[PDB]
Amino acid sequence: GDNEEVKKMLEKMIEEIKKMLEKAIKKVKEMLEKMIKEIKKMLENGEDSEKILKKAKEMAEKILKMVIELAEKILKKAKEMAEKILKKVKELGVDNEEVKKMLEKMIEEIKKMLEKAIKKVKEMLEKMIKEIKKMLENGEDSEKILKKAKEMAEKILKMVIELAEKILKKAKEMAEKILKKVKELGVG
């Protein structure tokens, strides 16, 4: 039936968000690893701070840009799927405002958390760079600097993971509410 179809559309939408979120985390991890690897190489060659920071700054900006792109695709794809669900639900009523508005909230929740992820990635990368600069200034050795860089990078990753999980949890709750309203459109 139509209710089961909508149920599965919602399941499919959230599964796709999940999959895209997993890929984003994987890409962010890999890029952070690369940044750290580059720092390690430079330290092993006794390079000066100025060279080390320039490269790190470049890497970080690249990470932020990719997080931005990835977030945009997630939101685009989510909106497309929500529109297809709204369209299916047109079979069940003329101008279904409550459903329409609930889908709108579902999308806005996703968006809000994605913007927060962008914001925290940006902020935290700035701080990682600042900390690197300070450690280079105060004569810390490679082991300490690398270890700290790894800790910082993992904190960024963990923040992205936490926000991804929140998105998924909220989207599922939402979907349950939406399905209930869709069911209420029907006779009995």
Residues 6+ apart with CB under 8 A from 26: none
Residue with tokens 């929740």: 109
110 contacts 34 by C-beta, under 8 angstroms = no
Closest CA to 85 of 72, 100, 73, 75: 100
Experimental approach was X-ray
182 contacts 89 by C-beta, under 8 angstroms = yes
Phi and psi for 139 in degrees, rounded to 5?
80, 20
State which H helix or E strand residue 180 sits in. Answer: helix 142-184
Residue 61 belongs to domain spanning: 1-188
**Distance (Å, rounded) from C-alpha 73 to C-alpha 156?**
21
Q: How many angstroms from the chain centroid is the CA of residue 133?
A: 27
Radius of gyration of the chain (CA): 22
Resolution as reported, in Å: 1.6
Q: What is the largest CA-CA distance in the chain?
A: 76
Handedness of CA 147, 152, 157, 158 (dihedral sign): positive
Reading the block at residue 56, the tokens are 């790190």
59 contacts 38 by C-beta, under 8 angstroms = yes
Total structural domains within the chain: 1
